[PDB]
Ligand binder design. Structure first.
Ligand code: PCD
Ligand code: PCD
Ligand SMILES: O=Cc1ccccc1
Ligand SMILES: O=Cc1ccccc1
Ligand SMILES: O=Cc1ccccc1
Ligand SMILES: O=Cc1ccccc1
Ligand code: FES
Ligand code: FES
Ligand code: FES
Ligand code: FES
Ligand SMILES: [Cl-]
Ligand SMILES: [Cl-]
Ligand SMILES: [Cl-]
Ligand SMILES: [Cl-]
Ligand SMILES: [Mg+2]
Ligand SMILES: [Mg+2]
Ligand SMILES: [Mg+2]
Ligand SMILES: [Mg+2]
Ligand SMILES: [Mg+2]
Ligand SMILES: [Mg+2]
Ligand SMILES: [Mg+2]
Ligand SMILES: [Mg+2]
Lengths: 907, 907
């Protein structure tokens, strides 16, 4: 051990440390500076950036031996605090740079380091700095972060006043549609919002820390578990196995379709008879620290009989493949789509037909914050779980039978969280921590490392797809045929539903009167399927939007004009036979057209012999809602202090549940003149907030926004004074009148798609957009650079533009990853950010352009649709279409790795 | 467990706590708010004061179940921080209220609570508030704290500007003699100085926490130790016993006098064959937490044979008493005093003689911070100990043979500390933590609770005394006889030396030509003797200063005039035959006289039938130095940045080592124009600071101040430019000239007192003072209230008036305790602050008056003497003399408990 006397955030510290200890652990654990965020733990994400003697360093890869006596360290807590914000922190708030906020401290500390060395950077300088310092963001697409640095720099330089970093209220007092900052931004930019790992450090001494004993093969029969060496190891309390589970030890899919061949009870909590994928949790070590639990987990011995594993859909779907879940066929679900007339004769007599085989793979969510949860037995006898769940009520019912609790005896709460992008539509750690809390009686905390986040959370499910179009010479679509095979890994939850998305979205955007197709879901031993932003559309629309360009090429038609010819107009129906609710695609195409033509001309002019430029187009469409007559609930409550609490379970991945609540409520409450800072939101809690539903399917703004609207309208009615005006809280209480008022809303016009035909009216609101990608391909290396992305977006009406702009930039950036670099195929190689192709800042162009072409929705609150998944529906199709524009080669199977492009260029 | 969402220092906290947990532990351990200081843990000291929903509460006695959802909590960290001080914090700094600083956060938070309820308090209101809220201070005597509250209130009230709370530099730029604030004040008042327990919370995960297995009888032979149940308990690493000690397992007294009958090796580190006092450490449990270590220590079983214990000096000194240390007589040392002619004939022929039997007891130091230390093995192979040692070099040599290390392989460091008042002149926990660090190889931390602080740290040693005077009718002293018996408990360290203090100080202040006396030191089974501020003078001078009043009464002379007649004047010698170095007692008496006469007249006027007022006088004298030719060393170093570091081992109990260094160096460096903020001090460290010696004997200002002066003079010489002016650092380094310069100083005129006669010249500088106490006795109850204290003080020259004023107020307050309420006699009843008679604010008058009558010392730096122990030399004699003035009764045996006074009143 050594004494080191240093200065931390301006205060001399008399530190006692191990020279080998990591600076991140010293700062977080010894000094309580949990504003130093840790994600990857491998020097790849920048979340743990600190200033050490004038240099920006990653604290997770800096050992204390590198910190000299008299060193100066700055963390986010030294940059500024809530009543004392630095210009960078104010700028982050103003520009909406904190979505989940998990990267915000590290970017802000890194940016201070930049500005202390280069006071007036160019945008390019800012991007180069964040590239060099590995500052990674999965939410924002980087552009808002660069905007904030530039604004802060201008203030620090005396070029503009610091007051201009503070939001100015619009003259009408309307925050709906404005850039009003989100309520959580200040806590995020100051490192004073505690995420799950932060909470773990601040739990009491009695808390047990868990480590998973995980399968290191993909498929096996389990013979036994020997915990004896582990029990003797330092700090070890006990080891938990399936024998300690008090219920069924299975998670239920809950809404398993009747025509699914499986019962939906296939997923274990702790493996008992079998390993179904690499990473499966077989046991939990409980210890006094994460480090001691992990060390002991390595010594737990699992005796198993390895079985042949099926590592892709086609392999598992083979007629003679062995059943992974004995008694259920590996191909456990099929969804037909049968619209209009038989397609065979139409293809036979059409002027033109095209066909393609396409593949979109096992995209990894890669939030900067790895999964984390905790649980405890309450003083009331209930089991409480605090996790990254984005569907607290959903998960309660998915896990309660398995853990052996009645629903009223379990409470799920959503912690502040550092992104999910859908993986938290699935249970991950909730049942594990519940079992351990119940077994021990003690609080328990489980933190996944980044390799566990990659290997042992769910993934986008790969689809193998064949799609065909028949058309007239003038480009009019006549018919489509489609076939898709969905590799869902071993756990069925929502896999049938995902497969149904192919019936809804392959070919969406156009009038297609005659469709015949079939989707099939297959269990495999690769990673189980969890929702990933777009949930079936990125697969579906990659196929159909690439195929539209192939059709245009075969006709000798411009691909934007081919889309214009076929795009939804009044009278048309979508693939499920439903009329669209608005018709904005022609408007968007007309507004894009001159920008597209200019981009084509630029690409021609700026191409060289070696660096070929191209432009690609695609359309995107997706529903806002869960299928059928989805619903939500909110409670609007006047508090004694005159503030209003809007109670919901709107789960915040980081997309903006807070600002969606406040902005929607503000608009609904305008007749009573309620200031936005007087409106409070509630963190999701199954005991004390209504069942607003999960934050999946780009649904909350529509469903919960409408419920908030209705609740607020009902509160206005409850407060109305006879003769005009409104009663105060005191007046209502004096009259024994209610002050907490419910509102509900249901998408009553919606119907579920039919099991035989696929037809129905599954959503009452959709999101519509048109993408343009501009790319350069180095034809010597096959490397593609995306130089610009544009999204024409119809969101109906914006609740908050900082929120929607950010959602779109983030989705576009994930689209660039999906197109060019990302996968989770190799269990070890793809288990790091860099290994799996995470997009760092230079991969994302500074030119991300949005044009709102908003057509108010009949059923949306104040006309709003959702936004969340729109920007990931098909940006990757536009990008691949741009590669084809540039070079003549079409990549059919994502991602477009350089060697793959090269092989195609040279063929 | 329960979730509680509250606001702490203005920031919303999502807390997870046990409802039974103490708020102090939650704040310190879970939230890292180590500015919430914990001392007593029993609700008696206020150090842990926090604001909870507008009320000031003691966090150590507030369980989390009392903290509601939505509560607001403020700790010192929320009051203000170093670059953002609250008016209360600025006022504390300006008024010198932070000496050790351990109480400062709690007083400041409590004071904010006061001012938030009463914006313009009277001084009386402030005192009532601190009484009610149990805010205890052992250093300051409270008056500076009240001063600071009043000043802050005036600023908060808009009555004066906040800039007036900032120190204004004197026009001459001289900080010597000024009220310049001490360097450590800001850290103290913001809770950002880490004391030993604070450091323990910030040590790494590998650190083992210790608990002592202690004797629960006063005397025994040990048969065995059974650790088997303890080893099975939660978090337990191991149990350490004498078998794990690698050296002699004894602490050496190091300077044991040759005529001591014992070898000075009597004290064990871990008891092996015997228990010698209640509390003796027999074993150490090492565990993952203090709580788990303590729980397991309760289960360690010690098999012993209890022996009859001798619980007082007279009991142990009986001719037939059994030897506590077999082979050494319990009366192990005698010191004669033989000055001038045989006293028997002089007593026989004197006009007047008086005699008394007096007792001063086992006063407990009662710092607000209980003892704490830690140790570790360095990366360099050495064992490092960080403790409350106020003699780091001394303790190294006292413990190294016992722990089994050569001196170069052990390093002792003084942590910031919350007071000692001398108990840390002894080793307490240093050898214990060293043994455990060496045995385990791991860092170890040991925190005493308050009962352990009381029972198992050393104490003022009781003296049973008989003193006699012979005098002429005109009051001229002719002769003195003296006998004293010193109860030193079982451990001999410095007990012989303490006994020699009786030869030096009984009767000090007056010319006494003929003295015959004998002191004896006796081992007992009550608590071992450690220095307590005054170290023999409070005992000695209680006897002689009470006896002077008895002589005055017998002569019918005024007691101030009797002292005036006999006080040192040129030609006189002190009891050891040495000439005083200055002669300030007549000056001080002459300046006090009219104040004394006015006080007498007030007492007569304001007395009532039931409440009798009186006035008492005493003189105090004490040396500044260790006996003989004491010495010190300092290094003055010009740093590259132009600051100057003055390297010393001046140990800071809280008295002001920091400001003594800076002020002395500033004065010495004036020719070079060095600003005070450019002068740095060093925390004591045996490896990297010179052997400046211990902070005992009121010596550091004289010894180390002179060494600092000499070092700085030598640095000036090293920097002098030919032709005038001074070279910069860069110029000196360019010329390869030295920049770190040594200075040494020795008290060359001093000699040790003779073993046969007691004569010598033990100190070259003394401190001189005259006390006046004003009291009221309720004759129905026997309760005494001290209404005022005055000290006339000759300190030569003041280094810093905030420091000296504070030292005097603190010593006067300890004198009130010693006179009226304090003891450690009952092992259990006296093991709490309240039980042992700690003086809370209402016991200490607001009227504490100092008059400096400074006579520059020939050998002091810039003429300075010490101050530390002067104010505790005889204030308790003045108080008892005042009780006699008021009521006619004399208390001979301290303390003057109400029942004791009543019995005397009614006899
Ligand atoms: N018009 C409009 C719309 C919208 N908005 C906004 O925006 C947001 C969003 O919304 P939406 O769309 O409704 O959504 P939500 O439901 O809330 O959420 C969800 C999503 O969200 C997204 N985004 C995001 N972001 C971020 N940052 N992070 C994340 O993680 C995430 N995730 C993702 C996903 S995946 Mo799934 O589960 O797969 O189906 S679905 C999803 C919010 O804040 C709101 O409010 C506005 O403003 N306006
Ligand atoms: N002239 C003069 C003198 C002095 N000063 C200051 O004052 C202080 C003190 O000093 P001195 O006297 O020199 O002393 P020191 O050595 O440093 O110290 C010690 C002491 O100190 C005291 N004080 C105090 N305070 C406080 N706060 N706390 C404490 O704990 C204490 N402790 C106590 C004791 S006890 Mo023995 O060990 O028994 O012998 S001794 C003693 C310092 O700060 C200095 O600098 C000045 O200013 N001036
Ligand atoms: O309410 C949660 C849920 C989840 C999946 C489908 C439908 C509803
Ligand atoms: O966005 C994720 C999701 C998951 C299940 C159903 C609908 C949406
Ligand atoms: O240097 C420490 C010391 C201690 C007691 C007496 C003499 C010196
Ligand atoms: O003030 C404490 C002390 C102890 C030993 C020798 C001199 C002084
Ligand atoms: S770079 Fe340190 S946590 Fe990712
Ligand atoms: S805001 Fe950057 S990772 Fe979420
Ligand atoms: S009153 Fe709480 S530590 Fe003393
Ligand atoms: S300053 Fe108050 S206890 Fe030391
Ligand atoms: Cl391909
Ligand atoms: Cl490649
Ligand atoms: Cl008595
Ligand atoms: Cl009494
Ligand atoms: Mg500022
Ligand atoms: Mg089944
Ligand atoms: Mg038509
Ligand atoms: Mg590969
Ligand atoms: Mg202020
Ligand atoms: Mg011996
Ligand atoms: Mg004379
Ligand atoms: Mg008694």
């Amino acid at each position: 051990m050594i004494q080191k006397v240093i200065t931390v955030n301006g205060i001399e510290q008399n530190l006692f440390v191990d020279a080998e200890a990591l600076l991140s652990d010293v700062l977080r654990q010894q000094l309580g500076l949990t504003g130093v965020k840790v994600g990857c733990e491998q020097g790849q994400c920048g979340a743990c950036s600190v200033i050490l003697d004038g240099k920006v360093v990653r604290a997770c890869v800096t050992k204390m031996k590198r910190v000299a006596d008299g060193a100066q360290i700055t963390t986010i807590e030294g940059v500024g605090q809530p009543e004392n914000l630095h210009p960078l922190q104010k700028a982050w708030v103003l520009h909406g740079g904190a979505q989940c906020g998990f990267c915000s401290p590290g970017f802000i500390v890194s940016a201070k380091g930049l500005l202390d060395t280069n006071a007036d950077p160019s945008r390019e300088d800012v991007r180069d700095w964040f590239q060099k310092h590995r500052n990674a963001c999965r939410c924002t697409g980087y552009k808002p972060l660069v905007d904030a640095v530039m604004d802060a720099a201008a203030v620090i330089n005396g070029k503009k006043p610091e007051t201009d970093l503070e939001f100015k209220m619009p003259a009408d007092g309307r925050i709906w549609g404005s850039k009003y900052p989100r309520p959580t931004a200040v806590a995020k930019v100051t490192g004073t919002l505690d995420y799950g790992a932060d909470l773990g450090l601040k739990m009491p001494a009695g808390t047990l820390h868990l480590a998973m004993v995980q399968a290191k093969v993909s498929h096996a029969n389990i013979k036994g578990i020997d915990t004896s060496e582990a029990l003797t190891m330092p700090g070890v309390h006990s080891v938990i196995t399936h024998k300690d589970v008090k219920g069924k030890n299975r998670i239920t899919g809950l809404i398993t379709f009747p025509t699914n061949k499986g019962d939906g009870w296939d997923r274990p909590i702790l493996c008992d008879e079998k390993v179904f994928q690499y990473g499966d949790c077989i046991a939990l070590v409980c210890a006094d620290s994460e480090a001691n639990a992990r060390a002991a987990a390595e010594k737990v011995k699992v005796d198993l009989e390895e079985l042949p594993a099926y590592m892709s859909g086609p392999a598992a779907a083979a007629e003679d493949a062995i059943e992974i879940h004995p008694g259920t066929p590996n191909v456990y679900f099929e969804q037909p789509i049968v619209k209009g007339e038989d397609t065979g004769p139409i293809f036979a007599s059409a002027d033109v037909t095209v066909e393609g085989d396409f593949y979109v793979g096992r995209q990894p969510h890669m939030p900067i914050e790895p999964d984390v949860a905790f649980a405890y037995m309450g003083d009331d006898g209930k089991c409480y779980i605090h996790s990254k769940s984005i569907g607290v009520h959903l998960h309660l019912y998915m896990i309660a039978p398995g853990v052996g609790l009645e629903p009223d005896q379990l409470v799920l709460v959503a912690n502040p969280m550092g992104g999910t992008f859908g993986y938290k539509f699935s249970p991950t750690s909730e049942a594990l921590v519940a079992v351990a809390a119940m077994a021990t009686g003690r609080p328990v905390h489980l933190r996944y490392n980044y390799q566990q986040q990659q290997q042992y959370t769910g993934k986008r499910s790969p689809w193998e797809m064949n799609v065909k179009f028949a058309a007239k010479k003038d480009g009019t679509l006549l018919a489509m045929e489609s076939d898709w095979l969905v590799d869902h890994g071993p756990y069925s939850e929502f896999g049938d539903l995902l497969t149904l998305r192919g019936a809804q979205f392959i070919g969406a955007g156009y009038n297609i009167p005659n469709i015949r197709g079939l989707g099939r879901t297959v269990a495999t031993n690769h990673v189980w399927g969890s929702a990933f932003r777009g949930y079936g559309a990125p697969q579906s629309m990659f196929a159909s939007e690439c195929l539209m360009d192939m059709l245009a090429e075969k006709l000798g038609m411009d691909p934007l004009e081919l889309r214009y010819k076929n795009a939804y107009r009044p009278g048309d129906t979508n693939p499920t036979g439903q009329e669209p609710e608005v018709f904005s695609l022609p408007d968007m195409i007309d507004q894009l057209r001159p920008k597209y033509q200019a981009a084509l001309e630029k690409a021609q002019k700026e191409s060289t012999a070696t660096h070929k430029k191209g432009v690609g187009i695609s359309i995107g469409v997706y529903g806002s809602g869960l299928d059928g007559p989805d619903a939500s609930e909110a409670w609007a409550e006047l508090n004694a202090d005159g503030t209003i609490t809007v109670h919901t379970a709107w789960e915040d991945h980081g997309q903006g549940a807070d600002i969606g609540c406040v902005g929607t409520a503000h608009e609904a409450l305008r007749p009573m003149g309620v200031a936005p800072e007087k409106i409070k939101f509630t963190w999701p809690n199954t005991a004390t907030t209504p069942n607003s539903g999960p934050s999946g399917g780009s649904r909350q703004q529509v469903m919960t926004g409408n419920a908030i609207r209705v609740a607020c309208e009902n509160l206005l009615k409850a407060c109305e004074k006879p003769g005009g005006g409104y009663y105060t809280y005191d007046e209502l209480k004096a009259a024994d009148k209610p002050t907490k008022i419910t509102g509900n809303w249901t998408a009553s016009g919606a119907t579920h798609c039919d099991a035989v035909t696929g037809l129905g009216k599954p959503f009452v609101v959709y999101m519509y957009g048109v993408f343009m990608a501009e790319v350069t391909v180095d034809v010597a290396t096959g490397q593609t650079t995306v130089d610009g992305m544009t999204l024409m977006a119809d969101l109906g009406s914006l609740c908050n533009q900082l929120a929607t702009d950010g959602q779109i930039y983030g989705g576009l950036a994930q689209g660039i990853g999906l197109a060019l670099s990302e996968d989770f195929e190799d269990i070890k190689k793809h288990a790091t950010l860099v290994g799996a192709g995470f997009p760092f800042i230079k991969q994302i162009p500074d030119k991300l352009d949005i044009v709102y072409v908003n057509h108010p929705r009949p059923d949306g609150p104040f006309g709003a649709s959702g936004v969340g998944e729109l920007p990931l529906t098909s940006p990757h199709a536009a990008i691949i279409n741009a590669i084809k524009s540039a070079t003549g080669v079409r990549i059919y199977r994502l991602p477009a790795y350089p060697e793959k492009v090269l092989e195609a260029l040279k063929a």
